[PDB]
mmCIF file of C-alpha atoms and ligand atoms in Angstrom:
data_model
loop_
_atom_site.group_PDB
_atom_site.id
_atom_site.type_symbol
_atom_site.label_atom_id
_atom_site.label_comp_id
_atom_site.label_asym_id
_atom_site.label_seq_id
_atom_site.Cartn_x
_atom_site.Cartn_y
_atom_site.Cartn_z
ATOM 1 C CA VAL A 1 -1.872 21.012 -4.921
ATOM 2 C CA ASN A 2 -2.900 17.698 -5.766
ATOM 3 C CA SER A 3 -6.479 15.863 -6.313
ATOM 4 C CA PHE A 4 -6.573 13.937 -3.035
ATOM 5 C CA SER A 5 -9.760 14.800 -1.080
ATOM 6 C CA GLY A 6 -11.196 14.105 2.635
ATOM 7 C CA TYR A 7 -7.764 13.108 4.029
ATOM 8 C CA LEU A 8 -6.954 13.847 7.590
ATOM 9 C CA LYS A 9 -3.250 14.916 7.811
ATOM 10 C CA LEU A 10 -1.152 13.312 10.194
ATOM 11 C CA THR A 11 1.865 14.919 9.792
ATOM 12 C CA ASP A 12 3.787 17.008 7.216
ATOM 13 C CA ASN A 13 3.475 14.185 4.681
ATOM 14 C CA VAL A 14 1.028 11.543 5.837
ATOM 15 C CA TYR A 15 -2.294 11.640 5.113
ATOM 16 C CA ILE A 16 -5.205 8.994 6.265
ATOM 17 C CA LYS A 17 -8.859 8.623 5.018
ATOM 18 C CA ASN A 18 -11.452 5.557 5.504
ATOM 19 C CA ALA A 19 -11.807 4.336 2.198
ATOM 20 C CA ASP A 20 -11.889 1.431 -0.194
ATOM 21 C CA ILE A 21 -8.298 1.504 -1.862
ATOM 22 C CA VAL A 22 -9.882 0.443 -5.295
ATOM 23 C CA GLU A 23 -12.841 3.077 -5.409
ATOM 24 C CA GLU A 24 -10.272 5.771 -4.209
ATOM 25 C CA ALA A 25 -7.814 4.743 -7.052
ATOM 26 C CA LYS A 26 -10.437 4.840 -10.072
ATOM 27 C CA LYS A 27 -11.305 8.348 -8.902
ATOM 28 C CA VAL A 28 -8.348 10.208 -8.299
ATOM 29 C CA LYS A 29 -5.986 8.010 -11.053
ATOM 30 C CA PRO A 30 -2.904 8.560 -8.813
ATOM 31 C CA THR A 31 0.459 8.380 -10.274
ATOM 32 C CA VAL A 32 1.035 5.460 -8.060
ATOM 33 C CA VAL A 33 -0.976 3.120 -6.135
ATOM 34 C CA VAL A 34 0.772 0.735 -3.762
ATOM 35 C CA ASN A 35 -0.377 -2.902 -3.822
ATOM 36 C CA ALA A 36 0.204 -5.126 -0.816
ATOM 37 C CA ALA A 37 1.735 -7.975 -2.652
ATOM 38 C CA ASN A 38 3.714 -11.187 -2.031
ATOM 39 C CA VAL A 39 6.930 -12.393 -3.360
ATOM 40 C CA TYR A 40 5.238 -14.136 -5.762
ATOM 41 C CA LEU A 41 2.753 -11.657 -6.961
ATOM 42 C CA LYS A 42 0.061 -13.772 -6.559
ATOM 43 C CA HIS A 43 -2.722 -11.509 -5.786
ATOM 44 C CA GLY A 44 -5.590 -13.554 -4.404
ATOM 45 C CA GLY A 45 -7.006 -11.664 -1.737
ATOM 46 C CA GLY A 46 -6.820 -8.670 0.667
ATOM 47 C CA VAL A 47 -5.896 -5.339 -1.014
ATOM 48 C CA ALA A 48 -4.119 -7.088 -3.791
ATOM 49 C CA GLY A 49 -7.070 -9.382 -4.643
ATOM 50 C CA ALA A 50 -9.346 -6.571 -4.844
ATOM 51 C CA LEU A 51 -6.925 -4.576 -6.852
ATOM 52 C CA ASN A 52 -6.676 -7.086 -9.309
ATOM 53 C CA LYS A 53 -10.190 -7.859 -9.291
ATOM 54 C CA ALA A 54 -10.634 -4.274 -10.428
ATOM 55 C CA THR A 55 -8.099 -4.765 -13.172
ATOM 56 C CA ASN A 56 -10.279 -7.591 -14.705
ATOM 57 C CA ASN A 57 -7.200 -9.918 -14.099
ATOM 58 C CA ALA A 58 -4.753 -8.050 -16.054
ATOM 59 C CA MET A 59 -2.680 -7.256 -13.027
ATOM 60 C CA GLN A 60 -2.382 -10.825 -12.579
ATOM 61 C CA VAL A 61 -1.921 -11.365 -16.084
ATOM 62 C CA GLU A 62 1.173 -8.657 -16.157
ATOM 63 C CA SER A 63 2.697 -9.941 -12.997
ATOM 64 C CA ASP A 64 2.895 -13.614 -14.157
ATOM 65 C CA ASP A 65 4.963 -12.320 -16.965
ATOM 66 C CA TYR A 66 7.211 -10.396 -14.339
ATOM 67 C CA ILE A 67 7.703 -13.540 -12.138
ATOM 68 C CA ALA A 68 8.604 -15.464 -15.113
ATOM 69 C CA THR A 69 11.205 -13.331 -16.212
ATOM 70 C CA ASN A 70 12.609 -11.958 -12.917
ATOM 71 C CA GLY A 71 12.000 -14.704 -10.077
ATOM 72 C CA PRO A 72 10.266 -13.667 -7.029
ATOM 73 C CA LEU A 73 10.496 -10.366 -4.850
ATOM 74 C CA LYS A 74 12.263 -10.069 -1.761
ATOM 75 C CA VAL A 75 10.471 -9.620 1.806
ATOM 76 C CA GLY A 76 10.551 -5.762 2.260
ATOM 77 C CA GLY A 77 11.113 -5.435 -1.907
ATOM 78 C CA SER A 78 9.152 -3.603 -4.631
ATOM 79 C CA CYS A 79 8.507 -3.651 -8.604
ATOM 80 C CA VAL A 80 6.755 -1.058 -10.570
ATOM 81 C CA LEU A 81 4.320 -2.218 -12.697
ATOM 82 C CA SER A 82 1.367 -0.947 -14.787
ATOM 83 C CA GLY A 83 -1.303 0.788 -12.883
ATOM 84 C CA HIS A 84 -4.111 -0.520 -15.605
ATOM 85 C CA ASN A 85 -7.087 1.283 -14.832
ATOM 86 C CA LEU A 86 -6.305 2.123 -11.589
ATOM 87 C CA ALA A 87 -3.141 4.619 -11.627
ATOM 88 C CA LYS A 88 -0.351 5.340 -13.964
ATOM 89 C CA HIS A 89 1.828 2.796 -11.996
ATOM 90 C CA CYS A 90 1.477 0.016 -9.209
ATOM 91 C CA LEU A 91 3.963 -0.192 -6.901
ATOM 92 C CA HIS A 92 3.957 -3.739 -5.691
ATOM 93 C CA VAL A 93 5.209 -3.642 -2.024
ATOM 94 C CA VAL A 94 5.995 -6.830 0.000
ATOM 95 C CA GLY A 95 5.324 -6.510 3.781
ATOM 96 C CA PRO A 96 6.409 -9.117 5.912
ATOM 97 C CA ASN A 97 3.469 -11.565 6.725
ATOM 98 C CA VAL A 98 3.141 -12.383 10.464
ATOM 99 C CA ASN A 99 0.927 -15.223 9.342
ATOM 100 C CA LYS A 100 3.982 -16.922 7.738
ATOM 101 C CA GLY A 101 6.465 -16.107 10.506
ATOM 102 C CA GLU A 102 8.138 -13.068 8.449
ATOM 103 C CA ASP A 103 10.467 -10.628 10.491
ATOM 104 C CA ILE A 104 8.387 -7.578 11.298
ATOM 105 C CA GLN A 105 11.433 -5.496 10.945
ATOM 106 C CA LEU A 106 11.492 -5.807 7.217
ATOM 107 C CA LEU A 107 8.394 -3.644 7.651
ATOM 108 C CA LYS A 108 10.702 -0.497 7.558
ATOM 109 C CA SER A 109 12.406 -1.712 4.524
ATOM 110 C CA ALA A 110 9.192 -2.298 2.755
ATOM 111 C CA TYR A 111 7.823 1.219 3.576
ATOM 112 C CA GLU A 112 11.390 2.561 2.442
ATOM 113 C CA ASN A 113 10.284 1.902 -1.219
ATOM 114 C CA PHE A 114 7.570 4.700 -0.908
ATOM 115 C CA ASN A 115 10.631 7.044 -1.066
ATOM 116 C CA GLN A 116 11.345 6.324 -4.698
ATOM 117 C CA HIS A 117 7.863 8.262 -5.468
ATOM 118 C CA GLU A 118 6.797 11.746 -4.646
ATOM 119 C CA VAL A 119 3.318 10.934 -4.047
ATOM 120 C CA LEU A 120 1.370 7.593 -3.540
ATOM 121 C CA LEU A 121 -1.861 6.234 -2.605
ATOM 122 C CA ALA A 122 -1.205 3.558 -0.631
ATOM 123 C CA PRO A 123 -2.736 0.641 2.156
ATOM 124 C CA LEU A 124 -1.032 0.012 5.449
ATOM 125 C CA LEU A 125 1.823 -2.551 4.865
ATOM 126 C CA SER A 126 1.274 -5.814 6.747
ATOM 127 C CA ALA A 127 -2.118 -4.967 7.526
ATOM 128 C CA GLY A 128 -5.155 -7.082 7.211
ATOM 129 C CA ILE A 129 -4.428 -10.364 6.170
ATOM 130 C CA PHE A 130 -0.905 -10.084 6.538
ATOM 131 C CA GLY A 131 -1.358 -10.252 10.253
ATOM 132 C CA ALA A 132 0.554 -7.319 11.590
ATOM 133 C CA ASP A 133 -0.770 -4.474 13.864
ATOM 134 C CA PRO A 134 -2.013 -1.765 12.012
ATOM 135 C CA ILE A 135 -1.205 0.807 14.452
ATOM 136 C CA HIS A 136 2.436 -0.303 14.567
ATOM 137 C CA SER A 137 2.318 -0.063 10.719
ATOM 138 C CA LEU A 138 1.426 3.346 10.954
ATOM 139 C CA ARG A 139 3.881 4.222 13.232
ATOM 140 C CA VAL A 140 6.810 2.635 10.927
ATOM 141 C CA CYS A 141 5.072 4.374 7.868
ATOM 142 C CA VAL A 142 5.293 8.191 9.664
ATOM 143 C CA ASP A 143 8.587 7.329 10.580
ATOM 144 C CA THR A 144 10.288 5.912 7.204
ATOM 145 C CA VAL A 145 8.498 7.610 4.387
ATOM 146 C CA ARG A 146 9.451 11.164 3.693
ATOM 147 C CA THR A 147 7.524 11.633 0.502
ATOM 148 C CA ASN A 148 3.827 12.271 0.605
ATOM 149 C CA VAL A 149 1.626 9.461 1.293
ATOM 150 C CA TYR A 150 -2.060 9.140 1.111
ATOM 151 C CA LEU A 151 -3.083 6.199 3.095
ATOM 152 C CA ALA A 152 -6.453 4.544 2.449
ATOM 153 C CA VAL A 153 -7.958 2.503 5.501
ATOM 154 C CA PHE A 154 -10.721 0.311 4.358
ATOM 155 C CA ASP A 155 -12.647 -0.442 7.780
ATOM 156 C CA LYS A 156 -14.285 2.526 9.477
ATOM 157 C CA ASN A 157 -13.510 0.996 12.909
ATOM 158 C CA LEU A 158 -9.926 0.609 12.322
ATOM 159 C CA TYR A 159 -9.503 4.009 10.866
ATOM 160 C CA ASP A 160 -11.182 5.625 13.846
ATOM 161 C CA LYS A 161 -8.694 3.446 16.229
ATOM 162 C CA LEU A 162 -5.651 4.672 14.323
ATOM 163 C CA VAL A 163 -6.654 8.198 14.347
ATOM 164 C CA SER A 164 -7.530 8.025 18.014
ATOM 165 C CA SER A 165 -4.409 6.532 19.096
ATOM 166 C CA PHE A 166 -1.933 8.475 16.664
ATOM 167 C CA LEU A 167 0.796 10.164 18.569
HETATM 168 O O1 QJC B 1 -5.323 -3.262 2.257
HETATM 169 C C1 QJC B 1 -6.445 -3.303 3.003
HETATM 170 C C2 QJC B 1 -7.696 -4.227 1.709
HETATM 171 C C3 QJC B 1 -8.562 -3.177 1.344
HETATM 172 N N1 QJC B 1 -9.437 -3.641 0.683
HETATM 173 N N2 QJC B 1 -9.842 -5.177 0.515
HETATM 174 C C4 QJC B 1 -9.160 -6.043 1.619
HETATM 175 O O2 QJC B 1 -9.648 -7.539 1.880
HETATM 176 C C5 QJC B 1 -8.031 -5.495 2.167
HETATM 177 N N3 QJC B 1 -6.679 -3.735 4.303
HETATM 178 C C6 QJC B 1 -5.404 -3.292 5.319
HETATM 179 C C7 QJC B 1 -6.000 -3.528 6.586
HETATM 180 C C8 QJC B 1 -7.550 -3.273 6.410
HETATM 181 C C9 QJC B 1 -8.353 -4.310 7.482
HETATM 182 F F1 QJC B 1 -7.994 -5.275 7.852
HETATM 183 C C10 QJC B 1 -8.232 -2.077 6.042
HETATM 184 O O3 QJC B 1 -7.306 -1.384 5.478
HETATM 185 O O4 QJC B 1 -8.986 -1.400 6.810
HETATM 186 C C11 QJC B 1 -7.827 -4.125 5.136
#
């Protein structure tokens, strides 16, 4: 038993809700919140900008130190950093950004990072400003992640489309 509430169960291990991931994280304090990161951990917009804003820019400060030490992430890769006031940990995961021409097949590699964590609150990778089809992203998620994932979808309209079209 865990503290996630109001989720629709899609599969044995994948759950989905129309929610703002920032507010969801603030209430649940999950062990892991996933950020839709880029390789530079520049949290300007989308989910990343919103999560970082909710940390009063502490996520960005920590991220800049991480990059200065380690260099950029790989597309499809991840790193674990602090969850600040939102979660114990933040798993920064880099999905491919279609608006940069990145290979969509890397989306499966990105979701594989979730399997290193037993339970996660997450957005749909490569959705939103990353330019992928959220329905494809949901399919890859279900077919790749084996751990328990609670997906927050900010847009009510997209949420309804994702549920109604789910196979
Ligand atoms: O991750 C986010 C997000 C969350 N909060 N603020 C943001 O700008 C972006 N996504 C993924 C797809 C999205 C709609 F395009 C949705 O979830 O409905 C937005």
